[PDB]
Every structure is written in structure tokens, then in C-alpha cells.
Amino acid sequence: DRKAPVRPTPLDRVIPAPASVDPGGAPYRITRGTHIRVDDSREARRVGDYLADLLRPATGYRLPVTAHGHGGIRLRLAGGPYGDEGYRLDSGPAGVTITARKAAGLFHGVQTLRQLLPPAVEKDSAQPGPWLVAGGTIEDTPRYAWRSAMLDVSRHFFGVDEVKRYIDRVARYKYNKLHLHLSDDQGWRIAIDSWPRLATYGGSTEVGGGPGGYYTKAEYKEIVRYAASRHLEVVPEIDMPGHTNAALASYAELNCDGVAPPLYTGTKVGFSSLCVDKDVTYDFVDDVIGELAALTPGRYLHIGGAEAHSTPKADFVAFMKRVQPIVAKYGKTVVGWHQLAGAEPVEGALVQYWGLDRTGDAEKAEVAEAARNGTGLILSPADRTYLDMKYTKDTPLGLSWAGYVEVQRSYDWDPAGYLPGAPADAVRGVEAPLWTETLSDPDQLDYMAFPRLPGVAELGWSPASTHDWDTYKVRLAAQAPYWEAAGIDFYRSPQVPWT
């Protein structure tokens, strides 16, 4: 009875593990006449409609969303110790009630609810159910405020609809930020009015050659809107001064020798660099950041800064000293890869650490020192959360430069005591980046993203006290029938006792 269990799945069997789970009493059962009761507000109905849309296909129920009556499923905004993202979920014969202070909390409660329901809920045609929800109470709040997923749309371009699909994949696990890697050596993916060729030429191809693509400002705006409806704050990244061949190939004047390099379709890194000694370089950066900031309602702007191997150390420092202020000029908070820690991060900046266990102490120290100086840390170790890394030497896709990364390794660590010498309070959260040198279609993205994606979300959300591989793997194994029913391909790791 894998697809449609006789009894409801345990109230605690969800990912991320909730802060508090108190099972008790009989379950709730959604039936044909169930109404979704919400408060009389736009944001309330919004979450209500979102839930109805997720349930209507598999149940074949009407599931009206209204601001009156005593609906079997109620979403209510009220006071409580749930913060901006937490919620309380009560379940029993009397119905299911999700209470929170804000819409994001109700949304997160919905993500928990869809896991309490059976795998059949993922189907597109009416199913028999039963639509059971374990009885009891769940009180949930997040450990970290920065819980993100990155999608590389530069190595291989993914259109608006494919990005929306990935957004829905991550929304399942309460991620709250979407990092979009909009530019690299193989492509520039955002139209900039002041430099039209960046998109039309710089975005004309991708890894492996052939058609590439890019987002018009309208398309980017739609991605931001869709992400916002899924409570994901979009963090756009324009990598600099390295990983800039797409831009360099589009405008000869940006190159130190004044010659535009060919469009790049390979998979190597670290060979490109903006020309630090030219004034035009900074007019370019200002124009791009200014236009990107205007399209970004979010608080952050990622300027990258990693693998600028064609940029002398002194030049890199000088470059970052000059460009960081540009971000604040346009009202945003700068974010950069941890190499920025070696280039005097400005006040309020955050750095994304992608180091490994084997990274030298000197490099780790530089980042820990930045943390001591007030720089926020986003943890995404290359040998832990880089979703493009192979599970084993036999994985058909992905890379292996950071060694192999099985499911347990990706999950089995604690952000608070990860980087030696770094103050725990400097850790803002975690991120799971999905690079695309080897991935060209949505299904391939799924195979490399799952099953490690839920694990990184747990690290960002769950209390350290709930962290345990032996019990976590059981909750992860439980996702199998859901992904199968939803058509989500995933790596059936031998470390997980799949249900």
C-alpha cells in the first residue's frame, strides 16, 4: 500500500524535521465537501488558493476558498511565537488549522501538510485517497533565516517555465531564497538596455554550443513574481571580475587588449577577467548593477567574486574595493563568494563559503575572521551541498573535482560548528547550489538535486537537536512514493532505505 497507505504517515515524518511534534488523537480526513477557510485578506486567499490548487487534481474535490464558515481546513493569521516564517498546525476530527503571524508561515504550514497527506496527493487525476492527516499538534520555526537554492542558468539556459518548475521543487522544503546565477563564461542571461549585445550576443549560446537564451526584463520580473508567490526572495548574481567571458565576448572594449574573445562553450573555469585597469570597466559594472537592482525587490545583490584566476591578487582587491560601493549606491546588500573575505567586505555584506573539509587553514581563517568582523556567512561547502557533484564514481552526470558526495555526507554536519573559529552567530544559513555544466534538461536537474535537496533545507530549518542521520534517512526514504507519483526523478542512494 505504498501509493495509498491504510493509515496516515506519522505526524513527525516530514522534512525539514519540525521544531516540535506532539502526536495525539484521531486524524483529520479531507472529504469531498471540505472548504478551505481563510481570513478576509488578499494574502490569506492567496495561500488558500495555492493549497486548493495543490489538492484539487488528486482529490478531484472542489475545495472552495472562502472567508466565511467553519472550513475543515483553516488558515489563520494571529499572534503567536512563530515569527515571520513559523506556524502551528493542529489536526484532528474537527479539522486542520494552520496558524501563523504572516502569510509565509501559513505557506510553510502548507508544505508540511502536503507531506502529512499520502503520496497519491501528487497525482494529476482523482484518486481514492484516503486523504488522512495524522492527529496532533506541530509548532515550527526556522533555525536560520538564509535557506537558499541556486540555479545556474548560464552553463545551460533554462527558460521561465523551467525555472518555475525548479522553484516549485524547492518550495516543498521551505527554502526562502532563490539564488540565480545569471552570468558566466558560457552565457549572459539578463537583458541590459545600456549594453544590448550582452543578451543578444552574450546569451546566444551555452555549454556544448547551439542556442542559448536569456530573460527579457519582463521575463525576469515574472520569475521574481512567481518566486515571491512561493515565498522565495530572488538573489540575482552577476559574477565579477572573473567568469565574465560572455560579457567580454560581447564588447571588445571591455577586454584588456581591446579584442573580444570568442563565445565560450567549454566547461573550464578561471580564465576570464574584466580589465581592472580600464575606466570603461566600472561604467559597465555600474550600468549593469543599476539595471539589475531596479528589477530586484529583494534586499541582496550577488557580485560573485570567485575564481578570478586571471585577475592578480592586488587587482582583485582594488576591483572589489571599487565595485562593492556600487551595490549600496543602488540600495542593496552585497553578497559574494568567500573570496571576497580577502578583499575587505563592506559593512553589511555576506559571503558565501564554498570551501571543503580539505581546504587549507589559511583560507578557512580568512573567512572566520570576516565572520568576526561582522560579515554574514552563507554555508555551501563544495563537498557537501554542491548538487552538481557526483554521488559516486559511477554517477552519469555531474562533476567530481570536490570528491564524491553521497546523501549522508551532504546531510551529516552542523552549520553552527562547521567553520573552525567562526562565531556561530555569524552563520546566516545555508545554500544548495546546482551548477549546470553537465545538465541540459529539467529531468537531469531533478536527478542531481534529489535526494540531497531536502537535506540542505533541513540544515537550514530544523533545530540542531533534531539532527540525526539514522532517523533522518527514514524520513527521506518516505519521500520515494511521493517523488515517483509526482514524476520527480531522483538518485536511489543505497544509503537510504527507500519506501
Ligand SMILES: CC(=O)N[C@@H]1[C@@H](O)[C@H](O)[C@@H](CO)O[C@H]1O
Ligand atoms: C563559486 C564558483 O565560482 N564555483 C565554480 C563554478 O564556476 C563551477 O561551475 C562549479 C563546479 O562544481 O564550482 C566552481 O568551479
Ligand SMILES: [Cl-]
Ligand atoms: Cl514540484
Ligand SMILES: [Cl-]
Ligand atoms: Cl576549454
Ligand SMILES: [Cl-]
Ligand atoms: Cl577548470
